[PDB]
Amino acid sequence: EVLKPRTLADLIRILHQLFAGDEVNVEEVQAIMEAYESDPTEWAMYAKFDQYRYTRNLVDQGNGKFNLMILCWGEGHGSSIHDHTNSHCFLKMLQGNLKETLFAWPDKKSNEMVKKSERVLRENQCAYINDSVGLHRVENISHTEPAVSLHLYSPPFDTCHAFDQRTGHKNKVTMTFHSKFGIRTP
Ligand SMILES: [Fe+2]
């Protein structure tokens, strides 16, 4: 049924096709991303880790239609609570496991933020979020093993908001790249 990419390169070629149009079948993309079985030999050149925080490694720019990146989560590394600037956001496990916590959007009022969902992303699993779905944070469940995830964001975006869990108050964040196309960035 689902078109099974046999390599990361096959998957990228398919994604160029699915995003060439104006419509995007979210469930179709999710299934094909999930069908690709992670192969470290194919993405090791992008798995550039850092001691203190997770890293963002650009893989492909999707002919301007999407950002395809790989995120490298060290032991105990996790994200802030954040939004996704009106884009489709697909997140596939390549190695290890992320805990995904979904949060409701805060009010004008200051308040502890509310969890809507909490789950562990399995091997090769592809998850999906956008701003209408909620906010989230992802965390490596392991303090002894890394996690690696493949992210597709459509359209691409440079900035999002981080939210304080005690308050709901938000700061604008400009996202940066640790490496692009396997090459380290300034
Ligand atoms: Fe996210």
Tell me, letter by letter, the H, E, C secondary structure of 71-122.
EEECCCCECCEECCCCCEEEEEEEECCEEEEEECCCCCCCCCCCEEEEEECC
Q: Which of 186, 169, 158, 173 is CA-nearest to residue 86? A: 158
**Fold of the domain built from segment(s) 1-186:** Jelly Rolls (2.60.120)
Pairing mode, if any, of strands 55-60 and 179-180? parallel
Give residue 83 CA to ligand 1 midpoint distance, Å.
7
Tokens matching residue 87 = 């884009």
Q: Is 49 exposed, middle or buried (0-12, 13-18, 19+ CB in 10 A)?
A: middle
Q: Can you tell me the distance from the alpha carbon of 141 to that of 32, in angstroms, rounded to the nearest whole number?
A: 25
Cα(81) to centroid of ligand 1, in Å? 8
CB-based burial, 50-81: b 16+ in 10 Å, e otherwise: eeeebbbbbbbebeebbbbbbbbbbeebbbbb
User: What's the DSSP call for residue 39?
Assistant: -
**Distance in Å, CA 100 to ligand 1 centroid:** 9
Q: How far is CA 100 from the centre of its chain?
A: 11
What strands lie across the sheet with 81-82, from one edge to the other? 115-120, 98-103, 135-140, 81-82, 159-163, 170-174
Token digits of residue 186? 């300034």
121 and 94 Cβ atoms separated by less than 8 Å = no
CA distance 118 to 138: 10
126/87 Cα distance (integer angstroms): 16
As for the chain, the residues directly before each break of C–N over 2.5 Å are none
If you measure from the C-alpha of residue 183 to the centroid of ligand 1, how many angstroms do you get, rounded to a whole number?
23
Q: Facing residues of 89 across strands?
A: 129, 153
Tell me, in angstroms, the distance from the centre of ligand 1 to residue 186's CA: 23
What are the extents of the domains in the chain? 1-186
Interval between CA 119 and ligand 1 midpoint (Å): 14
- One-letter amino acid for residue 180 of the chain: K
The method of structure determination was X-ray
What does the block give as tokens for 157? 């975006």
How far apart CA 8 and CA 156 sit, in angstroms, is 20
Residue set of the binding site for Fe cation: 82, 84, 136
Q: Residue 114 Cα, ligand 1 centroid: separation in angstroms? A: 17
The encoded tokens of residue 34 equal 């999930």
- The first and second tokens of residue 80, run together, are 């802030």
| Ligand 1 mean position, distance from CA 73 (Å) | 13
- State the DSSP string of 112-154: PPPEEEEEE--TT-EEEE-TTT-EEEEEES-SSS-EEEEEEEE
Tokens coding 139: 């965390």
